[PDB]
Write an enzyme that holds these catalytic residues in place. Sequence first.
Site, PDB file in Angstrom:
ATOM      1  N   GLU A 257      -0.609 -10.735   9.775  1.00  0.00           N
ATOM      2  CA  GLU A 257       0.555  -9.909   9.474  1.00  0.00           C
ATOM      3  C   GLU A 257       1.826 -10.367  10.172  1.00  0.00           C
ATOM      4  O   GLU A 257       2.923 -10.054   9.690  1.00  0.00           O
ATOM      5  CB  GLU A 257       0.298  -8.446   9.865  1.00  0.00           C
ATOM      6  CG  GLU A 257      -0.865  -7.802   9.134  1.00  0.00           C
ATOM      7  CD  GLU A 257      -0.576  -7.522   7.674  1.00  0.00           C
ATOM      8  OE1 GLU A 257       0.615  -7.505   7.271  1.00  0.00           O
ATOM      9  OE2 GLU A 257      -1.549  -7.307   6.922  1.00  0.00           O
TER      10      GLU A 257
ATOM     11  N   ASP B  89       7.505  -6.453   2.519  1.00  0.00           N
ATOM     12  CA  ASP B  89       6.224  -7.148   2.439  1.00  0.00           C
ATOM     13  C   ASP B  89       6.157  -7.995   1.166  1.00  0.00           C
ATOM     14  O   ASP B  89       7.141  -8.135   0.432  1.00  0.00           O
ATOM     15  CB  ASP B  89       5.062  -6.173   2.636  1.00  0.00           C
ATOM     16  CG  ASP B  89       4.765  -5.312   1.406  1.00  0.00           C
ATOM     17  OD1 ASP B  89       5.440  -5.427   0.363  1.00  0.00           O
ATOM     18  OD2 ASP B  89       3.809  -4.509   1.492  1.00  0.00           O
TER      19      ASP B  89
ATOM     20  N   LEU C  56       3.333  -0.323   6.800  1.00  0.00           N
ATOM     21  CA  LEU C  56       4.055   0.123   5.613  1.00  0.00           C
ATOM     22  C   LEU C  56       4.828   1.404   5.917  1.00  0.00           C
ATOM     23  O   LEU C  56       4.270   2.367   6.450  1.00  0.00           O
ATOM     24  CB  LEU C  56       3.063   0.382   4.479  1.00  0.00           C
ATOM     25  CG  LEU C  56       3.655   0.991   3.207  1.00  0.00           C
ATOM     26  CD1 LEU C  56       4.623   0.032   2.538  1.00  0.00           C
ATOM     27  CD2 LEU C  56       2.536   1.387   2.257  1.00  0.00           C
TER      28      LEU C  56
ATOM     29  N   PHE D 123      -7.021  -2.480   5.826  1.00  0.00           N
ATOM     30  CA  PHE D 123      -5.673  -2.472   6.385  1.00  0.00           C
ATOM     31  C   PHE D 123      -4.660  -2.934   5.342  1.00  0.00           C
ATOM     32  O   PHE D 123      -3.594  -2.328   5.185  1.00  0.00           O
ATOM     33  CB  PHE D 123      -5.665  -3.371   7.626  1.00  0.00           C
ATOM     34  CG  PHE D 123      -4.404  -3.318   8.439  1.00  0.00           C
ATOM     35  CD1 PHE D 123      -3.293  -4.055   8.069  1.00  0.00           C
ATOM     36  CD2 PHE D 123      -4.348  -2.565   9.604  1.00  0.00           C
ATOM     37  CE1 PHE D 123      -2.140  -4.035   8.836  1.00  0.00           C
ATOM     38  CE2 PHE D 123      -3.203  -2.548  10.379  1.00  0.00           C
ATOM     39  CZ  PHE D 123      -2.100  -3.271   9.988  1.00  0.00           C
TER      40      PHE D 123
ATOM     41  N   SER E 162     -18.566  -6.470  -5.358  1.00  0.00           N
ATOM     42  CA  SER E 162     -18.554  -7.251  -4.125  1.00  0.00           C
ATOM     43  C   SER E 162     -19.273  -6.512  -3.008  1.00  0.00           C
ATOM     44  O   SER E 162     -19.999  -7.121  -2.212  1.00  0.00           O
ATOM     45  CB  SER E 162     -17.112  -7.506  -3.682  1.00  0.00           C
ATOM     46  OG  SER E 162     -16.307  -8.033  -4.714  1.00  0.00           O
TER      47      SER E 162
ATOM     48  N   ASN F  77     -17.277 -13.465  -6.041  1.00  0.00           N
ATOM     49  CA  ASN F  77     -16.847 -12.222  -6.678  1.00  0.00           C
ATOM     50  C   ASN F  77     -15.552 -11.702  -6.061  1.00  0.00           C
ATOM     51  O   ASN F  77     -14.671 -11.204  -6.777  1.00  0.00           O
ATOM     52  CB  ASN F  77     -17.952 -11.178  -6.574  1.00  0.00           C
ATOM     53  CG  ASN F  77     -17.663  -9.948  -7.407  1.00  0.00           C
ATOM     54  OD1 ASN F  77     -17.190  -8.935  -6.889  1.00  0.00           O
ATOM     55  ND2 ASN F  77     -17.919 -10.041  -8.710  1.00  0.00           N
TER      56      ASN F  77
END
Length: 162
Positions: free
Chosen positions: A11, A20, A32, A104, A117, A132
């Site tokens: 990040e 972002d 965010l 996250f 998955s 996948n």
Amino acid sequence: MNIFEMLRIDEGLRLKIYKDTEGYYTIGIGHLLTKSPSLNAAKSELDKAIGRNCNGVITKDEAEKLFNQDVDAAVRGILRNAKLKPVYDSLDAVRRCAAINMVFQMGETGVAGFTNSLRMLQQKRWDEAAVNLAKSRWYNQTPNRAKRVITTFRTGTWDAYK
Ligand SMILES: Cc1ccccc1C
Ligand SMILES: [Cl-]
């Protein structure tokens, strides 16, 4: 390596409001603020989150505290979710970090499309899960991030971050 170091690499750190990859107002280590296009709405969310009048800028200490709260919230979200918790509890500690990383980035609702998955990961079919996981908007939009996370699921090592 641990989840905090992993997410700090993925990040980055910025002390002023930024956008972002999707264009949403963000600050700190990927926190965010809002999906609203209004910078004023983002500044209001920031002041509420920090508890002072920030005018769009925070300190490193404030960014690190928000980050701790955000990681905690991701873990709690996994543990409260009846679909995610059994898969999470089946994983080793390194792969658990890859799981937190996805939550996250995309939230509980963003990972809802990954049911197939999740089943492969619970069965420890690592190569099959990796393929996948890559068949996703996630992989196509943020491929380098996704490759690091998928490699962590595939190998159970930190090699993609070293
Ligand atoms: C997003 C998530 C959550 C819990 C276990 C595995 C995965 C991929
Ligand atoms: Cl990327």
